[PDB]
Amino acid sequence: MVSRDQAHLGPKYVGLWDFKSRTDEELSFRAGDVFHVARKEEQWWWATLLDEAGGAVAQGYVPHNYLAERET
C-alpha cells in the first residue's frame, strides 16, 4: 500500500523466522506478516501483530536482531 502523504513516519516490520510462541515475551506468528512498533525501549523493542485488515491481534516484544524493518 503506497502512501502519498508522509506526515507520520513508521513503516511496517517483518521478520519472525516462522517462530510461533505461546508466551507474551514472544510473538505467536510466522514471518511474512507485517507489524508496527508500539514502544521503543533501549533494551527490547515492542511489536504488535495485526491482521490483514490492520487490526491488532498478537502482542509481544523482541530484539531487532529477530525482526527487520521494511522501509517503503
Curated annotation (Swiss-Prot):
Phosphotyrosine carried by residues: 13, 61, 66
SH3 domain: residues covered: 8-72
Post-translational modification: Autophosphorylated.
Tissue expression from the record: Epithelia-specific. Very high level in colon and high levels in small intestine and prostate, and low levels in some fetal tissues. Not expressed in breast or ovarian tissue but expressed in high percentage of breast and ovarian cancers. Also overexpressed in some metastatic melanomas, lymphomas, colon cancers, squamous cell carcinomas and prostate cancers. Also found in melanocytes. Not expressed in heart, brain, placenta, lung, liver, skeletal muscle, kidney and pancreas.
Subcellular localization(s) per the UniProt record: Cytoplasm; Nucleus; Cell projection, Ruffle; Membrane
Signal peptide: none
Job description of the protein: Non-receptor tyrosine-protein kinase implicated in the regulation of a variety of signaling pathways that control the differentiation and maintenance of normal epithelia, as well as tumor growth. Function seems to be context dependent and differ depending on cell type, as well as its intracellular localization. A number of potential nuclear and cytoplasmic substrates have been identified.
Domain observations: The SH3 domain plays a major role in substrate interactions. The SH2 domain of PTK6 plays a role in protein-protein interactions, but is likely more important for the regulation of catalytic activity.
Family stated for the protein in its record: Belongs to the protein kinase superfamily. Tyr protein kinase family. BRK/PTK6/SIK subfamily.
Subunit-structure text: Interacts with GAP-A.p65. Interacts (via SH3 and SH2 domains) with KHDRBS1. Interacts (via SH3 and SH2 domains) with phosphorylated IRS4. Interacts with ADAM15. Interacts (via SH3 domain) with SFPQ. Interacts with EGFR and ERBB2. Interacts with STAP2. Interacts with PNX. Interacts with SFPQ. Interacts with PTK/ATK. Interacts with CTNNB1.
Further facts: The inhibitors bind to the ATP-binding pocket.
Name this polypeptide is given: Protein-tyrosine kinase 6
Naturally occurring in which organism (per UniProt): Homo sapiens (Human)
Part of the whole protein covered: 1 to 72 of 451
